[PDB]
């Protein structure tokens, strides 16, 4: 599923991500935009043989099981395939554990390089929320 901007903002708020660990809704919408262009089925192979899955590009090295990432962990206790669903529950629950890990939203290299410090409120502007 490819979400619209305000549609994803609403689903993220419903699932409790708005202000989670102090990050406003606009930060989470901006991160999804540059990670996946709002497409739940996005995948991207890394140089190290791991893979990033879904609307927030969560990596199989630590967070989910794909059966093909040697020596990896599955800290979210889920198959990576659950991260590609039209229902975002699994992605949001796993993102909560990632953003709690010590480095905040800097865990997402695209949020640090494209969203951090910018006018992130623009991502939720005009949305009926
Ligand atoms: Cl957009
Ligand atoms: Cl915001
Ligand atoms: Cl594996
Ligand atoms: Cl394969
Ligand atoms: Cl594990
Ligand atoms: Cl599994
Ligand atoms: Cl959803
Ligand atoms: Cl923080
Ligand atoms: Na894994």
Curated annotation (Swiss-Prot):
User: What EC numbers are recorded for this enzyme?
Assistant: 3.2.1.17
Residue pairs linked by disulfide bridges in the UniProt entry: 6-127, 30-115, 64-80, 76-94
> Which InterPro entries does this entry report, sorted A to Z?
Glyco_hydro_22 (IPR001916), Glyco_hydro_22_CS (IPR019799), Glyco_hydro_22_lys (IPR000974), Lysozyme-like_dom_sf (IPR023346)
Misc. remarks from the entry: Lysozyme C is capable of both hydrolysis and transglycosylation; it also shows a slight esterase activity. It acts rapidly on both peptide-substituted and unsubstituted peptidoglycan, and slowly on chitin oligosaccharides.
What are the protein's UniProt keywords?
Answer: Allergen, Antimicrobial, Bacteriolytic enzyme, Disulfide bond, Glycosidase, Hydrolase, Secreted, Signal
Q: Which compartments is it annotated to reside in?
A: Secreted
From the UniProt record, list the reaction(s) this protein catalyses: Hydrolysis of (1->4)-beta-linkages between N-acetylmuramic acid and N-acetyl-D-glucosamine residues in a peptidoglycan and between N-acetyl-D-glucosamine residues in chitodextrins
An example Gene Ontology CC term for this record: cytoplasm
Q: Which residues bind substrate?
A: 101
The protein's name is Lysozyme C
The terms under GO molecular function for this entry are:
beta-N-acetylglucosaminidase activity; identical protein binding; lysozyme activity
Active site residues of this protein: 35, 52
Q: In which tissues is it expressed?
A: In the egg white and polymorphonuclear leukocytes.
- Record Pfam families: Lys
Which family is this protein grouped under?
A: Belongs to the glycosyl hydrolase 22 family.
Quaternary structure and partners: Monomer.
Q: State the coiled-coil residue ranges.
A: none
Q: What Gene3D superfamilies is this protein classified in?
A: 1.10.530.10
Q: Please give the biological process terms from Gene Ontology that the record holds.
A: cell wall macromolecule catabolic process; defense response to bacterium; defense response to Gram-negative bacterium; defense response to Gram-positive bacterium; killing of cells of another organism
The C-type lysozyme domain sits at: 1-129
Q: What does this protein do?
A: Lysozymes have primarily a bacteriolytic function; those in tissues and body fluids are associated with the monocyte-macrophage system and enhance the activity of immunoagents. Has bacteriolytic activity against M.luteus.
Write down the CDD domains for this protein, in alphabetical order.
LYZ_C
